[PDB]
Amino acid sequence: TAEQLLREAKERELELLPPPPQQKITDEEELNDYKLRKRKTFEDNIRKNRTVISNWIKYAQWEESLKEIQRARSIYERALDVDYRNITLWLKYA
RNA sequence: GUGCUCGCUUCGGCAGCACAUAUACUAAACGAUACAGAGAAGAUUAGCAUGGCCCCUGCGCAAGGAUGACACGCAAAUUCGUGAAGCGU
C-alpha cells in the first residue's frame, strides 16, 4: 500500500506548473493580439495534420466565439471545403 | 548627306538613281554578438522512416548536414432507479 500510495502522492505532485491567468482582456487591442497569437497556434495545430478533426472543431468553437461571423465563416468554410465525405462534420458546421 | 548620271541650260543652279525608321532587362537570406547546450519508460547513443505554411551542401531520381532540423491525450449525445416540495379536473 505504501508503493501505490507513494505513486499517488508522487503522481499528484508530478503536475507541471499551474496556469498563469493574469491580465485577462486588458490594454485594449492587446487582447486582439493575444487572440492573434491563439489563432496562430490553432492555425499551426490545424497545419500539423490536414486530417485533424478535433483541432478543426476547437477552431470552430473558439472561432464562432471570438471571430464573430466573418472569420468564423472562414473556419467553417475552410474546414467544410476541405471535407467532402464524413458529412457528420458538415452537420457540426451546419 | 555622299557618290554617280550633263538627265535639264550656266564650274556651284535644277532633276533622277543607290544607300532608308536604331536604344531599351536603354542613361541618370546571409554577416557581427551574449546566452546555453542537445530524442527513443533508470545512464549513454546507432540509425533509417512519415507530412510541411522549414531549408542549405551537393552536377545529380548519389548522398551529406547531433536519428539536417519542425513535429502532446476531446467524443457529431443519452437512458433508467430513490427521496423531498408545489399543482391537479
PDB file of C-alpha atoms (C1' of nucleotides) in Angstrom:
ATOM      1  CA  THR A   1       0.000   0.000   0.000  1.00  0.00           C
ATOM      2  CA  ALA A   2       2.947   2.348   0.565  1.00  0.00           C
ATOM      3  CA  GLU A   3       4.076   1.777  -3.030  1.00  0.00           C
ATOM      4  CA  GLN A   4       0.712   2.591  -4.616  1.00  0.00           C
ATOM      5  CA  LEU A   5       0.120   5.454  -2.174  1.00  0.00           C
ATOM      6  CA  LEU A   6       3.630   6.782  -2.821  1.00  0.00           C
ATOM      7  CA  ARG A   7       2.866   6.620  -6.543  1.00  0.00           C
ATOM      8  CA  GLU A   8      -0.358   8.519  -5.821  1.00  0.00           C
ATOM      9  CA  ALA A   9       1.432  11.314  -3.954  1.00  0.00           C
ATOM     10  CA  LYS A  10       4.330  11.496  -6.418  1.00  0.00           C
ATOM     11  CA  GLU A  11       1.858  11.363  -9.310  1.00  0.00           C
ATOM     12  CA  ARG A  12      -0.198  14.124  -7.684  1.00  0.00           C
ATOM     13  CA  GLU A  13       2.974  16.221  -7.360  1.00  0.00           C
ATOM     14  CA  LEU A  14       4.013  15.332 -10.933  1.00  0.00           C
ATOM     15  CA  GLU A  15       1.835  18.044 -12.495  1.00  0.00           C
ATOM     16  CA  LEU A  16       3.932  20.668 -14.287  1.00  0.00           C
ATOM     17  CA  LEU A  17       3.198  24.282 -13.235  1.00  0.00           C
ATOM     18  CA  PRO A  18      -0.126  25.996 -12.549  1.00  0.00           C
ATOM     19  CA  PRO A  19      -1.739  28.359 -15.071  1.00  0.00           C
ATOM     20  CA  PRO A  20      -0.510  31.958 -15.101  1.00  0.00           C
ATOM     21  CA  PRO A  21      -4.213  33.660 -15.980  1.00  0.00           C
ATOM     22  CA  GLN A  22      -3.140  37.262 -15.420  1.00  0.00           C
ATOM     23  CA  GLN A  23      -4.003  40.478 -17.279  1.00  0.00           C
ATOM     24  CA  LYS A  24      -7.135  38.962 -18.811  1.00  0.00           C
ATOM     25  CA  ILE A  25      -8.635  41.121 -21.586  1.00  0.00           C
ATOM     26  CA  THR A  26      -6.658  44.293 -20.863  1.00  0.00           C
ATOM     27  CA  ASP A  27      -4.821  47.086 -22.693  1.00  0.00           C
ATOM     28  CA  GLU A  28      -7.486  47.290 -25.444  1.00  0.00           C
ATOM     29  CA  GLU A  29      -6.031  45.857 -28.704  1.00  0.00           C
ATOM     30  CA  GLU A  30      -3.532  43.778 -26.698  1.00  0.00           C
ATOM     31  CA  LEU A  31      -6.365  41.277 -26.237  1.00  0.00           C
ATOM     32  CA  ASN A  32      -6.732  41.233 -30.026  1.00  0.00           C
ATOM     33  CA  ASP A  33      -3.004  40.495 -30.250  1.00  0.00           C
ATOM     34  CA  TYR A  34      -3.467  37.618 -27.801  1.00  0.00           C
ATOM     35  CA  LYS A  35      -6.333  36.405 -29.989  1.00  0.00           C
ATOM     36  CA  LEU A  36      -3.969  36.642 -32.966  1.00  0.00           C
ATOM     37  CA  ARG A  37      -1.397  34.505 -31.146  1.00  0.00           C
ATOM     38  CA  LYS A  38      -4.047  31.971 -30.116  1.00  0.00           C
ATOM     39  CA  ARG A  39      -5.456  31.885 -33.652  1.00  0.00           C
ATOM     40  CA  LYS A  40      -1.881  31.427 -34.879  1.00  0.00           C
ATOM     41  CA  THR A  41      -1.404  28.464 -32.536  1.00  0.00           C
ATOM     42  CA  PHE A  42      -4.686  26.996 -33.786  1.00  0.00           C
ATOM     43  CA  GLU A  43      -3.566  27.569 -37.382  1.00  0.00           C
ATOM     44  CA  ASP A  44      -0.297  25.753 -36.653  1.00  0.00           C
ATOM     45  CA  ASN A  45      -2.121  22.900 -34.908  1.00  0.00           C
ATOM     46  CA  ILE A  46      -4.502  22.531 -37.853  1.00  0.00           C
ATOM     47  CA  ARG A  47      -1.415  22.881 -40.063  1.00  0.00           C
ATOM     48  CA  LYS A  48       0.375  19.908 -38.480  1.00  0.00           C
ATOM     49  CA  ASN A  49      -2.365  17.468 -39.552  1.00  0.00           C
ATOM     50  CA  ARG A  50      -4.621  18.219 -42.515  1.00  0.00           C
ATOM     51  CA  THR A  51      -6.857  15.287 -41.497  1.00  0.00           C
ATOM     52  CA  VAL A  52      -7.283  16.627 -37.948  1.00  0.00           C
ATOM     53  CA  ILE A  53     -10.932  16.630 -36.843  1.00  0.00           C
ATOM     54  CA  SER A  54     -10.525  17.724 -33.213  1.00  0.00           C
ATOM     55  CA  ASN A  55      -8.312  20.755 -33.905  1.00  0.00           C
ATOM     56  CA  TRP A  56     -10.804  21.867 -36.563  1.00  0.00           C
ATOM     57  CA  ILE A  57     -13.685  21.530 -34.090  1.00  0.00           C
ATOM     58  CA  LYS A  58     -11.835  23.592 -31.475  1.00  0.00           C
ATOM     59  CA  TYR A  59     -11.021  26.167 -34.152  1.00  0.00           C
ATOM     60  CA  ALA A  60     -14.752  26.222 -34.921  1.00  0.00           C
ATOM     61  CA  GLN A  61     -15.799  26.713 -31.288  1.00  0.00           C
ATOM     62  CA  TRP A  62     -13.153  29.330 -30.482  1.00  0.00           C
ATOM     63  CA  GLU A  63     -13.797  30.808 -33.937  1.00  0.00           C
ATOM     64  CA  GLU A  64     -17.563  31.212 -33.526  1.00  0.00           C
ATOM     65  CA  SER A  65     -16.827  32.522 -30.026  1.00  0.00           C
ATOM     66  CA  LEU A  66     -14.236  35.239 -30.691  1.00  0.00           C
ATOM     67  CA  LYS A  67     -14.286  35.539 -34.509  1.00  0.00           C
ATOM     68  CA  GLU A  68     -17.927  36.741 -34.770  1.00  0.00           C
ATOM     69  CA  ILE A  69     -19.187  35.943 -38.312  1.00  0.00           C
ATOM     70  CA  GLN A  70     -16.547  36.608 -40.991  1.00  0.00           C
ATOM     71  CA  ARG A  71     -13.561  34.658 -39.659  1.00  0.00           C
ATOM     72  CA  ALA A  72     -15.873  32.023 -38.167  1.00  0.00           C
ATOM     73  CA  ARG A  73     -17.489  31.540 -41.578  1.00  0.00           C
ATOM     74  CA  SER A  74     -13.922  31.308 -42.897  1.00  0.00           C
ATOM     75  CA  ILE A  75     -13.136  28.487 -40.460  1.00  0.00           C
ATOM     76  CA  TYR A  76     -16.351  26.599 -41.219  1.00  0.00           C
ATOM     77  CA  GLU A  77     -15.909  27.377 -44.925  1.00  0.00           C
ATOM     78  CA  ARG A  78     -12.281  26.209 -44.979  1.00  0.00           C
ATOM     79  CA  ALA A  79     -12.934  23.031 -42.988  1.00  0.00           C
ATOM     80  CA  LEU A  80     -16.117  22.409 -44.985  1.00  0.00           C
ATOM     81  CA  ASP A  81     -14.225  22.991 -48.237  1.00  0.00           C
ATOM     82  CA  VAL A  82     -11.553  20.523 -47.070  1.00  0.00           C
ATOM     83  CA  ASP A  83     -14.155  17.872 -46.143  1.00  0.00           C
ATOM     84  CA  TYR A  84     -16.222  16.032 -48.764  1.00  0.00           C
ATOM     85  CA  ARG A  85     -17.266  12.762 -47.101  1.00  0.00           C
ATOM     86  CA  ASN A  86     -17.869  12.321 -43.345  1.00  0.00           C
ATOM     87  CA  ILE A  87     -20.963  14.519 -43.544  1.00  0.00           C
ATOM     88  CA  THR A  88     -21.290  14.445 -39.744  1.00  0.00           C
ATOM     89  CA  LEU A  89     -18.655  17.190 -39.647  1.00  0.00           C
ATOM     90  CA  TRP A  90     -20.752  19.111 -42.176  1.00  0.00           C
ATOM     91  CA  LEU A  91     -23.607  18.703 -39.691  1.00  0.00           C
ATOM     92  CA  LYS A  92     -21.358  20.128 -36.969  1.00  0.00           C
ATOM     93  CA  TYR A  93     -20.554  23.161 -39.123  1.00  0.00           C
ATOM     94  CA  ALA A  94     -24.239  23.393 -40.055  1.00  0.00           C
TER      95      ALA A  94
ATOM     96  C1'   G B   1      24.140  63.981 -96.943  1.00  0.00           C
ATOM     97  C1'   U B   2      27.510  61.380-100.213  1.00  0.00           C
ATOM     98  C1'   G B   3      28.571  59.000-104.729  1.00  0.00           C
ATOM     99  C1'   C B   4      27.003  58.568-109.759  1.00  0.00           C
ATOM    100  C1'   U B   5      24.220  60.055-114.326  1.00  0.00           C
ATOM    101  C1'   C B   6      25.155  66.711-118.109  1.00  0.00           C
ATOM    102  C1'   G B   7      19.325  63.765-117.049  1.00  0.00           C
ATOM    103  C1'   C B   8      17.966  69.685-117.933  1.00  0.00           C
ATOM    104  C1'   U B   9      20.728  75.464-119.957  1.00  0.00           C
ATOM    105  C1'   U B  10      25.311  78.446-116.665  1.00  0.00           C
ATOM    106  C1'   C B  11      32.022  75.019-112.624  1.00  0.00           C
ATOM    107  C1'   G B  12      28.259  75.656-107.963  1.00  0.00           C
ATOM    108  C1'   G B  13      21.685  76.089-110.219  1.00  0.00           C
ATOM    109  C1'   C B  14      17.507  72.246-111.006  1.00  0.00           C
ATOM    110  C1'   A B  15      16.323  66.721-111.880  1.00  0.00           C
ATOM    111  C1'   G B  16      16.863  61.215-111.360  1.00  0.00           C
ATOM    112  C1'   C B  17      19.211  56.517-109.121  1.00  0.00           C
ATOM    113  C1'   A B  18      21.760  53.834-104.813  1.00  0.00           C
ATOM    114  C1'   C B  19      22.416  53.939 -99.571  1.00  0.00           C
ATOM    115  C1'   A B  20      16.243  54.196 -95.847  1.00  0.00           C
ATOM    116  C1'   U B  21      12.673  54.032 -89.082  1.00  0.00           C
ATOM    117  C1'   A B  22      18.449  52.015 -84.177  1.00  0.00           C
ATOM    118  C1'   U B  23      18.284  52.112 -77.889  1.00  0.00           C
ATOM    119  C1'   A B  24      15.500  49.923 -74.039  1.00  0.00           C
ATOM    120  C1'   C B  25      16.265  43.985 -68.888  1.00  0.00           C
ATOM    121  C1'   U B  26      18.338  51.773 -72.701  1.00  0.00           C
ATOM    122  C1'   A B  27      21.424  56.649 -69.019  1.00  0.00           C
ATOM    123  C1'   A B  28      20.892  59.287 -64.722  1.00  0.00           C
ATOM    124  C1'   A B  29      18.513  35.043 -46.573  1.00  0.00           C
ATOM    125  C1'   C B  30      23.494  35.855 -45.002  1.00  0.00           C
ATOM    126  C1'   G B  31      27.472  38.944 -41.522  1.00  0.00           C
ATOM    127  C1'   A B  32      28.510  40.761 -36.001  1.00  0.00           C
ATOM    128  C1'   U B  33      27.114  39.254 -30.583  1.00  0.00           C
ATOM    129  C1'   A B  34      25.674  37.473 -25.082  1.00  0.00           C
ATOM    130  C1'   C B  35      23.179  33.009 -23.792  1.00  0.00           C
ATOM    131  C1'   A B  36      23.059  27.956 -23.219  1.00  0.00           C
ATOM    132  C1'   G B  37      23.827  23.475 -24.802  1.00  0.00           C
ATOM    133  C1'   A B  38      21.080  18.932 -27.059  1.00  0.00           C
ATOM    134  C1'   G B  39      15.342  12.286 -28.639  1.00  0.00           C
ATOM    135  C1'   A B  40      13.501   6.992 -28.156  1.00  0.00           C
ATOM    136  C1'   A B  41       9.822   4.401 -19.886  1.00  0.00           C
ATOM    137  C1'   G B  42      16.923   4.415 -14.519  1.00  0.00           C
ATOM    138  C1'   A B  43      22.712   6.354 -17.908  1.00  0.00           C
ATOM    139  C1'   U B  44      24.575   6.860 -22.561  1.00  0.00           C
ATOM    140  C1'   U B  45      23.912   6.854 -28.175  1.00  0.00           C
ATOM    141  C1'   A B  46      23.477   3.573 -33.524  1.00  0.00           C
ATOM    142  C1'   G B  47      20.275   4.855 -37.450  1.00  0.00           C
ATOM    143  C1'   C B  48      16.687   4.506 -41.186  1.00  0.00           C
ATOM    144  C1'   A B  49      11.455   6.239 -41.584  1.00  0.00           C
ATOM    145  C1'   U B  50       6.146   9.804 -42.241  1.00  0.00           C
ATOM    146  C1'   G B  51       3.529  15.091 -43.768  1.00  0.00           C
ATOM    147  C1'   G B  52       5.008  20.510 -44.414  1.00  0.00           C
ATOM    148  C1'   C B  53       2.987  27.170 -44.339  1.00  0.00           C
ATOM    149  C1'   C B  54      11.453  24.810 -42.740  1.00  0.00           C
ATOM    150  C1'   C B  55      15.906  24.712 -45.613  1.00  0.00           C
ATOM    151  C1'   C B  56      21.305  24.648 -47.025  1.00  0.00           C
ATOM    152  C1'   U B  57      25.506  21.466 -49.084  1.00  0.00           C
ATOM    153  C1'   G B  58      25.593  18.625 -53.115  1.00  0.00           C
ATOM    154  C1'   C B  59      26.215  18.268 -61.359  1.00  0.00           C
ATOM    155  C1'   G B  60      22.565  14.839 -59.584  1.00  0.00           C
ATOM    156  C1'   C B  61      15.974  10.147 -59.150  1.00  0.00           C
ATOM    157  C1'   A B  62      24.014   9.534 -55.305  1.00  0.00           C
ATOM    158  C1'   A B  63      24.187  11.365 -50.942  1.00  0.00           C
ATOM    159  C1'   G B  64      25.560  14.792 -46.760  1.00  0.00           C
ATOM    160  C1'   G B  65      24.214  18.462 -42.517  1.00  0.00           C
ATOM    161  C1'   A B  66      23.565  15.808 -33.405  1.00  0.00           C
ATOM    162  C1'   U B  67      18.188   9.870 -35.823  1.00  0.00           C
ATOM    163  C1'   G B  68      19.683  18.060 -41.298  1.00  0.00           C
ATOM    164  C1'   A B  69      16.250  20.405 -38.071  1.00  0.00           C
ATOM    165  C1'   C B  70       9.757  21.060 -37.148  1.00  0.00           C
ATOM    166  C1'   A B  71       6.511  17.974 -35.033  1.00  0.00           C
ATOM    167  C1'   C B  72       1.189  16.188 -26.778  1.00  0.00           C
ATOM    168  C1'   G B  73      -4.266  12.798 -24.991  1.00  0.00           C
ATOM    169  C1'   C B  74     -11.696  15.952 -26.931  1.00  0.00           C
ATOM    170  C1'   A B  75     -16.009  12.195 -28.383  1.00  0.00           C
ATOM    171  C1'   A B  76     -21.266  14.732 -34.134  1.00  0.00           C
ATOM    172  C1'   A B  77     -25.381  12.598 -27.476  1.00  0.00           C
ATOM    173  C1'   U B  78     -28.201   9.628 -23.745  1.00  0.00           C
ATOM    174  C1'   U B  79     -31.284   6.242 -20.812  1.00  0.00           C
ATOM    175  C1'   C B  80     -33.318   4.270 -16.146  1.00  0.00           C
ATOM    176  C1'   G B  81     -33.994   3.994 -10.282  1.00  0.00           C
ATOM    177  C1'   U B  82     -34.599   6.870  -4.777  1.00  0.00           C
ATOM    178  C1'   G B  83     -36.192  10.902  -1.667  1.00  0.00           C
ATOM    179  C1'   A B  84     -38.442  15.982  -0.747  1.00  0.00           C
ATOM    180  C1'   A B  85     -41.683  20.326  -2.171  1.00  0.00           C
ATOM    181  C1'   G B  86     -45.776  22.612  -5.229  1.00  0.00           C
ATOM    182  C1'   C B  87     -50.276  21.863  -8.570  1.00  0.00           C
ATOM    183  C1'   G B  88     -54.445  18.710 -10.178  1.00  0.00           C
ATOM    184  C1'   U B  89     -60.205  18.297 -13.419  1.00  0.00           C
TER     185        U B  89
END
